[PDB]
Amino acid sequence: TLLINQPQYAWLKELGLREENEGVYNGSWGGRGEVITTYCPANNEPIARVRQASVADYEETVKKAREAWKIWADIPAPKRGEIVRQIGDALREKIQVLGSLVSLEMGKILVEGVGEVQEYVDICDYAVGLSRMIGGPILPSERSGHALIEQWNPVGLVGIITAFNFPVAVYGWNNAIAMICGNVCLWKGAPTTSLISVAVTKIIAKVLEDNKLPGAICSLTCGGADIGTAMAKDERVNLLSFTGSTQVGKQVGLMVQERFGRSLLELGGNNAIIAFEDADLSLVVPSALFAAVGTAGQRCTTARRLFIHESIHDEVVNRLKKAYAQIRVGNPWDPNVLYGPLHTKQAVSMFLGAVEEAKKEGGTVVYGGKVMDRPGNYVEPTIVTGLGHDASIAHTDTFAPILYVFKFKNEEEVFAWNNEVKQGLSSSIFTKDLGRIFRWLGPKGSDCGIVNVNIPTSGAEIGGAFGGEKHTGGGRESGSDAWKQYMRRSTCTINYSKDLPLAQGIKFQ
Amino acid sequence: TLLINQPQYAWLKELGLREENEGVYNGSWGGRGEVITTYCPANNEPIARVRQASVADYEETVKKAREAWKIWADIPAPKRGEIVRQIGDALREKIQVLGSLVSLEMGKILVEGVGEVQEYVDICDYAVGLSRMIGGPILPSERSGHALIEQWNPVGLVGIITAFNFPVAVYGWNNAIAMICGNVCLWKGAPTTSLISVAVTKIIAKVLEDNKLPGAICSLTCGGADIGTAMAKDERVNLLSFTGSTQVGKQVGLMVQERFGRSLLELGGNNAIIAFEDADLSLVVPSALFAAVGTAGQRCTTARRLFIHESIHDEVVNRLKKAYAQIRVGNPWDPNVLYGPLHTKQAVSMFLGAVEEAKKEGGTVVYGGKVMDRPGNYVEPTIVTGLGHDASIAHTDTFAPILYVFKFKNEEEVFAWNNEVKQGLSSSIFTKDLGRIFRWLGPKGSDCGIVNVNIPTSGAEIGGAFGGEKHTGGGRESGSDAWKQYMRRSTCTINYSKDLPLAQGIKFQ
Amino acid sequence: TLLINQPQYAWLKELGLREENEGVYNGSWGGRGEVITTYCPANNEPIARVRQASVADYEETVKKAREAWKIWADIPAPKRGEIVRQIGDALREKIQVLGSLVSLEMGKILVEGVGEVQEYVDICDYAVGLSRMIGGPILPSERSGHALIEQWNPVGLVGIITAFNFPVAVYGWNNAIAMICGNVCLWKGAPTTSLISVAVTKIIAKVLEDNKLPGAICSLTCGGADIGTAMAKDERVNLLSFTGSTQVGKQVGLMVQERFGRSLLELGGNNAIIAFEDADLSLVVPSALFAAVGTAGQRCTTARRLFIHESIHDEVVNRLKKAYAQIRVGNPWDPNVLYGPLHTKQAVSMFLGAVEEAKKEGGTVVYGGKVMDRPGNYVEPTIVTGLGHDASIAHTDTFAPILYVFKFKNEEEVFAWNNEVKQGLSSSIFTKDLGRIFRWLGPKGSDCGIVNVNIPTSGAEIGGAFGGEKHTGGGRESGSDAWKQYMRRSTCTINYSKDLPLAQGIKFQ
Amino acid sequence: TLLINQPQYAWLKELGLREENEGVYNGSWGGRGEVITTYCPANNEPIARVRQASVADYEETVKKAREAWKIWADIPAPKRGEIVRQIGDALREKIQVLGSLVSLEMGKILVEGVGEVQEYVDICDYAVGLSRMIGGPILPSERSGHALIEQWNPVGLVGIITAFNFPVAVYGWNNAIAMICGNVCLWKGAPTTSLISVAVTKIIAKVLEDNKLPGAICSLTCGGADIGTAMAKDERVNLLSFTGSTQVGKQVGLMVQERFGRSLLELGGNNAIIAFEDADLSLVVPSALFAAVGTAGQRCTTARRLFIHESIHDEVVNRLKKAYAQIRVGNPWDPNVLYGPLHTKQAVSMFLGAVEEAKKEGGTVVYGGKVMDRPGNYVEPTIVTGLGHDASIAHTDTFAPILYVFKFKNEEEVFAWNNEVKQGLSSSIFTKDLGRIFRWLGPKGSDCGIVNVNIPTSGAEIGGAFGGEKHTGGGRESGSDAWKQYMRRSTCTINYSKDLPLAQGIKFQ
Ligand SMILES: N[C@@H](CCCC(=O)O)C(=O)O
């Protein structure tokens, strides 16, 4: 009855998964907490089982990771980068099968599952180069015979809590960067993507073990909220990177601040696309489509609000309705399928509640709005017109494929409306106007951390820093100098002289 | 009665100070809150009075500041730098008499008062050059016909809360940097340095108004804990920089996190100097003296722990005693005075309590330990030997001139003892050993934000970032790229083509 | 009959100039070579005289500069920045009278003369901040117990050869940057701007003397081609920065290479403005006017080629002709004069030589083309149409105010025509097309070192690097990390361990 | 007769080598010039033959590379990085046989042969990271409504001339960096390592072919000085990176300067190791051994001068003699030998010339000095004592394994003696003295491009820039921001507004 026992899914054994898998890894595999069974959202059938972490499992792992850190921090950064290079190779090798497991356990379509693993391969290549570059400037002291250098050192143990919707990539960004920065990692994933977490940890463990490194360098404790809270409250967790809901993120931030730890919060988005009158509609429509219905609307970067200039509102909406009706729905691993199930049955419930709440706040469902009559967690991608831009349901961020469409007239008001929500992740404008574009990029433009022009709100590349402002939580991951969040800066002055000139010329005599 | 009414203190009026002064500035001067009188700690005489902010003053000042921000953020950064340049020139012209006011109201000696003002002058020079440099990289997009740029924009209103012990420099570090980054500022100082806050703001307000700019760009609301708490709970304060006690800082970080604001925390230090057997003792003794007794021991970077290797412990301690007994006591505005009073009468009593608790816990007062027989808040700088490194009184947070002296034998134990406290601000080793110095700078060395060699724990220059780790709060000010804390990063992708290739080669069609 | 002996030019004495002035400074003033008289191009009247450098003068000056470098190089860079800050202040206080001398001796209008001095002011401000920043990274060594450091140190003596047309600013750019980088300078300006060079040198010398530093840190040796050739051949001149003709620059470049010195060449430009059909003509016409007739067309960044799309060629030409007729011609110090004389009587001949040649090669003079019958070296700013973009007269760059106008159709061809010339200094397109602008910035776009959009080819700001490609010589001055040309990089590996790991894991034992 | 026709050398076929090989590659393989036979320096037996380029081959190859660049420069940099990544992998997979070919045709020992290929692997890893990073800053313009951007674009065709002694790594540093920067490459190796150049080109060709890219992106034209002179005079070669003799490189720099090309010169080095009295002798002796006898003394970074403090001169010289006696001599393809032959018989003649001159000039051969009585180009590694530091023989340009040992007393004279040579590549001091180490890194310290402490002058790691000063020619390769030499910077100002504010506030009205 488990999918891993059925012959058409034997490929799961290529990831080393079996009927019951250990969900704790700290150099040894184990798990004394509750055995969880994860299910395929496309057909509600059980896949395999994972033994989750008890509290003793959590305690032992943290201790072994900190002991592993003593060895790992002594390994030169470029040699750490060589370990991350080998991880990138292992991922490359299994990108198709790991991508298939993402489609199977998470439910996003095969090209997105593969593409998500590509994000991990990309940031590995990136981190490999970064491991020969991380550091600070040597600066010219104002004092003779003094050297002034900025040093960066690992923070220690980096906890990583990831969400259901990107069960490989978010961990991969945090892992590759933290590792070359000399940190050890502790991973707690979404319980409903535990097989993916195990499969990824199996890949990493083999690399560590082949290199005669302690496996606790990349530790895994599968578990629910109790384990996540433990990490948020654990003084031995120097940096807690949390990707999840804003509500839970806020509490993670508070718990970390109470103990004077470090947090990196990557929280919800309420991302807007803005199509001005001069927009290239052949870019607008397919961009709104990918941003709205990509991943069945389940990215933190999904387009949730579409603002269209009055002159083109009807046409864009009609053109978008026709494109929705061509979306090919099916099993997320099937060829030509563009749209899969929602991840959980509760996500279907939430979708239903949001649709009905949108009607109660005066919206009109112009497309979709219904559960699909078929096995699995399938819902229709939905477009809602007629709501005020400040409608309560629109300012709520729901992980459901519902696109709230609004009219506007002037640039100034629509910038204000992009900015008026609590979230602050991604944003896009479609326009040809050179001046408007740079105003969008400037201090009176978009208040988000991702500020795009003529592309979807989703689909970032890894070379830039990824994250948001406001209620999205302020953390950054991946590229640019996001690596600095995973290290502690020291400002270092060395008197190599036989004198003691004081800063600012102070004569203390 | 008031010092400002006596002819010998007529120089206070060179700073625009009067018998009663407005403590609110926002383009207009006002103050409808409680009137406070500040006192000269060298003689316990009243200096002058300041009309603090009421709640209505605070509310109106924030509204004026955010209005001023609309203008100020539209001003090109180099032109904002020119304003800061002129502020630097204004401090330059007033440096002696501003320094003298710092000595009078706060109580540090004159070279420190002038030196503290000089830090503001220095960060002004630095920020002027920065105003032509701030920003992010243009990155190579993996996508044809796409540009990828990292942009930096002001966060908006920067609230700045400062302490009694650096009543000019800390505000200055924040102000110069926040200004060129296109932010407006709201300053709340220590009530017992209100005259200094008012005087500094009078200097800045004139530059702003001379440049026909709205004064609320650098707003001042003098007040106590209510004003600080209001700023911490106020969504209109985009970034709150807080320098103060660890306990209040923890409460400010929690409040700001509750509303998803940005905080920059600079809290207490419990800084150690470590002297190895190969140390040049002629560097040790004067460095210890200044680090411990400078500012009458009232810096967050004051050396409170002195670790001396067993072989040299008695000789360094004897030499410090002779050095201590030679320091010239007197009024702190008097040139060539080296030792002034503590800031308050309460501090004197807390100094006595610490000296008593040090004796209770086993320690021996080898020098000092008693109040001095003279007007004002004078205490003997004090040396306590014989305690264990883990003695309770030594892990405490006090602004009293007591130096706790410990013995050690080996490198590893004394690095660990340095790191064993809760704070993590400054640290220093004295040694000639090449390898030991690089180990101290590395991942197994000092855990502090400031990591010095053969110099005191105090007296940083502005060109590097200033701040600490662990319970020091994590914030950085002044140099390096601390300016990024005053701005929001955006990662910006611009599709300038007629096509829509997706990141990671994802084919969504 | 000297202008400086007339009462209306008494303001010259505010710069310390006299009837006959010393044109050698090395801490002392002197000059034993030939005496030069400079003439005011607006009336051809002699202004004053300058005693130029003999061979003995040059020898003694280089030696004194190199001896002064031993002191200067030991001053911490921020303290060298403080010197540059005072140079900036001295320039601020004399900006009007210095700009007037630029107008009197060089001949550009007063607003530009003042603007040119502002450039030196601006780069002083930049360099002051840079003096806290210059340096390289600390990198992660692949070898345990090794530090890896990029260090930057002065080259030593920077010779600076400047030209007649920017007789303050180019020296200024080189001066501020070289100084904070720890070099000493030796200046040989254009013979026909000798008083300007003396005036600027007097200003810097006072700052150096007021700071008790050897004046030879900023040495002057006024002279002609003999002194410049000596500098290019002199192994004691570590870096030679030459701004001048392509022809001379090539020989300078060869001579420095022959001796394995460092050269920084800023040579001629043949800058094109290209206006596409969708261009804002309200930006096009003023920008073209400023770029063509600014400085009577004697900048290396002056627009000499104007490509206009066929659809708008006639309209842009007509509007530009009407704009050329608005220009007020007069004495360059007279108010609201926008057009002054050419620098030399020789330039007037070449202008007439160029006009006759353009007609012979088939051009039509639609505006100007004649000498203005008045005192001074006044020629009409000229527009020439109907030539092929590949006509010889158009490629030979000369400083005559002659704009060559060309038609185009395709973006591809006209980008190629921008790039087909031997120089590669500045370039500008006028368009609204978002894709066109980013192609112009890209690898199939402009090949020039300055690549502008919707602005003239002249008028750079100091925050960026300044210089060109191809026959423009390759050097960069002023902003970005141009400072690195004035310093030597060293890559430094420090083994502080007891072991000897080899790079690349090479086992040699 | 040909080794490649002997069964024990069949491993050569694993590299695609044959009895007669094609020495031109531009997408297709050919070569119409002279057929060169390369020989094994360990036994003087012929290996295989290579058809070199005629000038028509060169002509056709340049034209093909320039067409390929039009395609290659359009490929996004991260995608170009992916090609280099696969080049890295292809090298990883062939590291043993390619290292053996280097050992066989060049003559260095196998562990260095492999290690040299490892440098190419390492720089591929670095370049892949870079390919996401290269770019310049976005700068805040002083003008409202203006963007200021520093852009980097490829130079076009990078001609790469390499030398016999590093026949793989030097090309690789240039290749990996030039490739990700969007340039195409044209390689001319040393004629006596023609098989190595063919073998590396075969590896890159397969990668290019497998990725459907034109092979001329990495073109090969094997040949001698006529081909090298052609590249130095060819305006189609935008950058010429030349590694070779000082005298040839000077002429290369002159030819390139004559045509306003870009050159990158990496010439000879007369590198010194300085041993102060406090030096750890257990680090000194092996470092001096490896730095002197590594590669049979044929590195440009080889240690030629060994300065030893008077007090330890005799001891280290005797300790270096006992190390020299332990050198294991034999054929270089053994994975266990330490010392192979010189590359050429003429190097033996030169070596014998220098030893005889050192003895004539008063030196004492204390070790070696003789040819080894076996087949091949074997000389004994030699130590020569008793010469002054300015003895003529010690200031020659000879790749001979002769180490010249000098005495010194104080730090100042010996720093000067390090600096007295014409070249400026590498340098190293052995000391524990902290102040001395920072003095050596500073402005009165070593003048070299590579400045090392307690390690060989040789054996750089790729993270930093590589190259020297003075007669070493000034170019930098590999790490840090050396990638900027392979690109052209542009300073780009974009007016996105409707106004025309001028720099420096010049009102042109
Ligand atoms: N690469 C993805 C990451 C989204 C992460 C998330 O939705 O939580 C994107 O840019 O849309």
Distance from residue A300's CA to the centre of ligand 1 (Å): 6
**Interface contact flag, C78 A136, Cβ < 8 Å:** no
Interface test with C, best of D450, D470, D491 (most C CBs within 10 A): D491
Mutation to probe ligand 1, out of A111, A265, A300 (largest number of atoms < 8 A from CB): A300
CA C482, CA C496: separation in Å to the nearest integer?
Answer: 33
Listed by number, the residues of chain C in 398-457 with a beta carbon closer than 8 Å to a beta carbon of chain D are 422, 437, 441-455
**Rounded to whole angstroms, how far apart are CA atoms D317 and B127?**
55
| Closest Cβ opposite residue D253 in set C257, C459, C488 | C257
**Residues contacting residue C125 through CB under 8 Å, at least 6 positions apart:** B81, B82, B85, B128, B129, B132, C85, C88
d(CA A81, CA A232): 28
Compute the C-alpha angle A173/A179/A185, nearest 5°: 80
Domains of chain D: 1-268+462-509 (3.40.605.10), 269-461 (3.40.309.10)
Q: Taking a C-beta distance cutoff of 8 angstroms, is the pair B301, B243 a contact? A: no
**Angle CA(A471)–CA(A473)–CA(A479) in degrees, nearest 5?**
135
Residues 259-278 (B) with a CB less than 8 A from some CB of A: 260, 262
Whole-angstrom distance, CA of residue C158 vs CA of residue C161: 10
User: Residue C495: which of A152, D290, A136 has the closest Cα?
Assistant: D290
Tokens of D108: 């260095």
Half-sphere exposure (CA, 13 Å, Cβ side) for A232?
A: 22
Q: Say which experimental method was used.
A: X-ray
Cα separation, A147 vs A137, in Å, equals: 11
When CB atoms are compared, the residue of B132, B142, B437 closest to D76 is: B142
How far is Cα C29 from Cα C9, in angstroms, rounded to an integer? 24
Q: What are B115's two structure tokens?
A: 């030196």
As a whole number of Å, the CA-based R_g of chain C is: 24
Rounded to an integer, what distance in angstroms lies between the CA atom of residue B438 and that of residue B454? 13
Write the DSSP string, C286-298.
HHHHHHHHGGGG-
What is the residue-wise DSSP string for A298-314? -STT-EEEEEEEGGGHH
Please report, to the nearest 10 degrees, the dihedral formed by the alpha carbons of residues C263, C268, C273, C274 taken in order.
-80
Strand pairing category for D35-40 and D45-51: antiparallel
Give the neighbor-by-neighbor strand order of the sheet with B426-430: A138-139, A146-154, A487-495, B450-453, B426-430, B271-275, B303-309, B402-408, B382-385, B364-367
Q: Which residues contact B117 (CB under 8 A, 6 or more apart)?
A: B91, B94, B95, B98, B99, B102, B168, B169
B37 to chain A nearest CA, in Å?
A: 30
Burial of D229 (0-12, 13-18, 19+ CB in 10 A): middle
Find the closest chain A residue to B137 by CA distance: A480
Decide: helix, strand or coil at residue B385. Answer: strand
Distance from the alpha carbon of residue A459 to the mean position of ligand 1, in angstroms: 6
Q: Which of residues 80-119 of B touch A (CB under 8 A)?
A: 111-112, 115-116, 118-119
Cα separation, D43 vs D378, whole angstroms: 10
In sequence order, the 6+-apart residues with CB closer than 8 A to the CB of C473 are C242, C246, C249, C253, C264, C265, C266, C267, C467, D260
Sign of CA dihedral C1, C3, C4, C10: positive
Q: Is the torsion defined by CA of B167, B168, B169, B170 positive or negative? A: positive
State both tokens at A448.
């988000």
Q: Quick check: CB of A404 below 6 Å from ligand 1?
A: no
Q: Distance (Å) from the C-alpha of residue A454 to the closest C-alpha of chain D?
A: 17
Whether residue A460 has its Cβ less than 6 Å from ligand 1: yes
How far CA A207 is from CA of A26, A160, A172, A215, A218, in Å, comes to 14, 20, 15, 9, 10
State the residue for tokens 């870096």: C239
| DSSP 8-state code for residue C164 | S
Backbone gaps in chain C, preceding residues (C–N over 2.5 A): none
For residues B67 and B270, what is the distance between their CA atoms, to the nearest angstrom?
41
**Chain A touching partners, 3 or more CB pairs below 8 A:** B, C, D
**Helix %, strand %, coil % for chain A, to 5?**
45, 20, 35
**How many CB pairs below 8 Å do chains C and D form together?**
252
C499 in Cβ contact with C144 (< 8 Å)? yes
Question: Distance between CA atoms of B325 and B314, rounded to whole angstroms?
Answer: 17
Give the integer Cα–Cα distance in Å for D269 and D236: 30
* Of residues D139, D151, D479, nearest to C441 (C-beta): D151
Which A-chain residues 378-397 have CB contacts (< 8 A) with chain B? none
Q: Which residues of C are catalytic?
A: 266, 300
Q: Are strands A477-478 and A465-466 parallel, antiparallel or unpaired?
A: antiparallel
CB-count exposure of residue D502 (10 Å: 0-12, 13-18, 19+): buried
CA atoms within 13 A on the CB side of A6: 9
Report how many Cβ contacts below 8 Å link chain A to chain B. 240
Name chain C's partners: 3 or more CB pairs within 8 A.
A, B, D
Which of left, alpha, beta for D260 (phi over 0: left; psi -120 to 50: alpha)?
A: left
Two tokens, residue C501 = 């790991």
| Ligand 1 and A299: CB distance under 6 A | yes
Residue type, A27: G
Which has the closest alpha carbon to C435: B501, A432, D497, D490? A432
Query: Who among B148, B422, B476 is closest to A489 (CB)?
Result: B476
C365 touches chain D (CB under 8 A): no
For tokens 């409707």, name the residue.
D498
Amino acid at C389: H
Question: ∠ at Cα B411 (B409, B414), nearest 5°?
Answer: 75
**Which among B476, B462, B481, B458 is positioned nearest to B121, based on CA atoms?**
B462
* Residues of B belonging to the active site: 266, 300
Indicate the DSSP class of residue D190.
Answer: -
Q: What angle do CA C442, C448, C454 make, to 5 degrees?
A: 75
Q: For residue D180, give both structure tokens.
A: 């990700």
C-alpha distances in Å from residue C28, one per residue of A19, C22, C70, C206 = 91, 10, 18, 12
- H or E segment to which residue B180 belongs: helix B169-180
| H or E element that contains B177 | helix B169-180
How many other C-beta atoms can be found within 10 angstroms of the C-beta atom of residue D427?
32
Judged by phi (left if over 0) then psi (alpha if -120 to 50, else beta), residue D344 lies in beta
Q: Which of C128, C461, C496 sits opposite B434 (nearest CB)?
A: C496
Local structure of C453: helix, strand or coil? strand
For ligand 1, what atom is nearest to the CA of residue A294? 11
Q: How far is the CA of A266 from the centre of ligand 1 (A)?
A: 10
For C255, how many CA atoms within 13 A lie in the half-sphere containing its CB?
A: 21
Locate D246 and state its tokens. Answer: 């000082």
Residue A455 CB neighbour total at 10 angstroms: 25
User: How far does residue A224's CA lie from ligand 1's centre (Å)?
Assistant: 22
The answer to whether D278 touches D431, Cβ cutoff 8 Å, is yes
Query: Is A492 near chain B, with CB under 8 Å?
Result: yes
CA distance D386 to D381: 17
Beta strands C382-385 and C402-408, pairing class: parallel
A301 lines ligand 1 (CB under 6 A): yes
Tell me which chain B residues have a C-beta less than 8 angstroms from the C-beta of D136. 137-138
Q: Distance between CA C504 and CA B439 in Å, rounded?
A: 23
Helix, strand, coil % (nearest 5) of chain B?
Answer: 40, 20, 35
Dihedrals φ, ψ of B322, to 5°?
-60, -40
Name chain B contacts of D143, Cβ cutoff 8 Å.
76
A504 CB within 8 Å of a chain C CB? no
Give the C-alpha separation, D81 to D180, whole Å.
5
The number of beta carbons lying within 10 Å of the beta carbon of residue C310 is 10
- Does the beta carbon of A458 lie inside 6 Å of ligand 1? yes
Nearest partner of D482 among D468, D470, D502, D465, judged by Cα: D465
Breaks (C–N over 2.5 Å) after residues, chain B: none
| CA angle, C440 then C443 then C445, to 5° | 25
Q: Rounded to an integer, what distance in angstroms lies between the CA atom of residue D34 and that of residue D29?
A: 15
Residue found by looking up tokens 């992980």 in the block:
A399
Alpha carbon distance D40, D341 (integer Å): 10
Place of tokens 């005020």: A388
**Taking the C-alpha atoms of D197, D199, D200 and D201 in order, what is their torsion angle to the nearest 10 degrees?**
80
- The tokens for D158 are 């990078």
List the single residue in B78, B128, B434 with the smallest CB-CB distance to C128: B128
Contact residues, chain D, for A496 at CB < 8 Å? 434-435, 437-438
Output phi, psi for D366, to 5 deg.
-95, -20
Beta bridge partners of C339: C329
* Contact with chain C for residue A149, Cβ under 8 A: yes
> Searching chain A, which residue's CA lies closest to the CA of residue D481?
A133
Centre of ligand 1 to C-alpha A374, Å, is 28
CA A493 to CA A150: how far, in whole Å?
Answer: 9
**Secondary structure class of C186 (helix, strand, coil):** strand
The length of chain D, given as a count of residues = 509
The residues, ordered by sequence, that sit 6+ positions from B391 with a Cβ below 8 Å of its Cβ are B358, B361, B362, B363, B404
DSSP 8-state class, residue D35:
E
Q: Return the SS3 of A379.
A: strand
- Helix, strand, or coil here: C212? coil
Q: Residue A289's closest CA among A437, A455, A42, A114?
A: A455
A479 neighbors A466 (Cβ within 8 angstroms):
yes
Helix (H) or strand (E) holding D489: strand D487-495
Q: Which of A126, A398, A458 to mutate to test the pocket of ligand 1 (most atoms within 8 A of CB)?
A: A458
Is the C-alpha dihedral spanning C481, C487, C488, C489 positive or negative?
negative
DSSP state of C432: -
Secondary structure (3-state) at D202: helix
User: Order of strands across the sheet with A29-30?
Assistant: A29-30, A24-25, A218-221, A184-188, A157-161, A239-243, A262-266
SS3 assignment, position B452: strand
Give me the residues paired with residue C274 across strands: C307, C429
User: CA-CA distances (angstroms) from residue B483 to B126, B177, B213, C429?
Assistant: 11, 6, 23, 34
User: Dihedral of CA D81/D87/D90/D92: which sign?
Assistant: negative
Neighbours of C150 (CB within 10 A): 22
Residues of A in contact with B473 (CB under 8 A): 260
